[PDB]
Symmetry: C2
Subunit: 209 residues, 2 copies
Amino acid sequence: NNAHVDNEFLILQVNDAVFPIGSYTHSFGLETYIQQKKVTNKESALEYLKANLSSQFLYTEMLSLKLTYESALQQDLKKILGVEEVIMLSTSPMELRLANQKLGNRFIKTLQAMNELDMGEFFNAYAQKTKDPTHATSYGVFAASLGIELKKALRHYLYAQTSNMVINCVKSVPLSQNDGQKILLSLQSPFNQLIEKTLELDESHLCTA
Amino acid sequence: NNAHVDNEFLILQVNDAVFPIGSYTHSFGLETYIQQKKVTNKESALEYLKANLSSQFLYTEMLSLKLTYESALQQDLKKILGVEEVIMLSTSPMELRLANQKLGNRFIKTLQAMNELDMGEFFNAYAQKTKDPTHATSYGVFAASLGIELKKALRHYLYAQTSNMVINCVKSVPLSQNDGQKILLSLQSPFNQLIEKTLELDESHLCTA
């Protein structure tokens, strides 16, 4: 059914800022750091981003993507829903939880609206049953369902999220556009460290940051 | 010098809509098609996009990217400048030519502002000598200079440009966001056809559409 679908383009399409699912929620956490004088320049923005990437973003978002990808390969819907339950029961404040659930639901619905894309029965079942989807967990199931390699799936998702984080810093601090690009370049080695760490973690580390 | 640079992330970074070089110029050509009732819905937008992609966008933009990539591998700056000369002497109207030159200059300058990225001597020389850079021609030299595979370089550039074309249609016609995503999905096979055709063409085809 997916002979006309090229995963090499589809992975760009679903990570594009124009993929119509709403804004990522990283700006929620950043808002306090600017008002309270912590993030003021390129250097302190870089510090904040490295710290964020290696804490909650790693132990919740990135890890959850890996876990639901791996569980989807095993057709273990119970484990996927279990992961989503842990995340929901750990996320504060409620406004952020609701924003995250909205984003996950919109990701699933936007895929389903593309009627000429067959997500397969396991994804169909996941979409029918999910109560607390997130962008990362639904994306993990999506990537596994289409046979997209895990490391690649992680790279594209990580870059897209981080581009959003950096542009939030550029607009909110504010910084020059050139400082934004220097930050993104500086984060490439951290990105590789983060992906390698993600592959070492498991359910026992979920939401532990 | 580039041990800390990962081309797999850099190619996403330079094709991101936030890469600070200004807007792509595809909307210039589209403006007439909407006012004059040609592009009115998803189907006619798809028709217009396929036609555009396989005409001037192929025989000027995509081909020029391939030509300057290949010439950069040969360290043939004369041929690169020759390609840019042909394009400049073929582009109408003057407002679009100036917009294209501005975009090419900004692409080069934005790369050069990232002081921790070494583009290499050949790129340095190209940047010193170029008179009529374009985004596609400068990107070709950039990709070859960093050892990014041609097909990959073409895929990321083609997707980014087409995402811009489709969102212009979504906003200007206007269309629903879902129709935009259906169009992008429908263009994946055309994309592969376009890349394969680009690899068959040479200087004798440049600007012939």
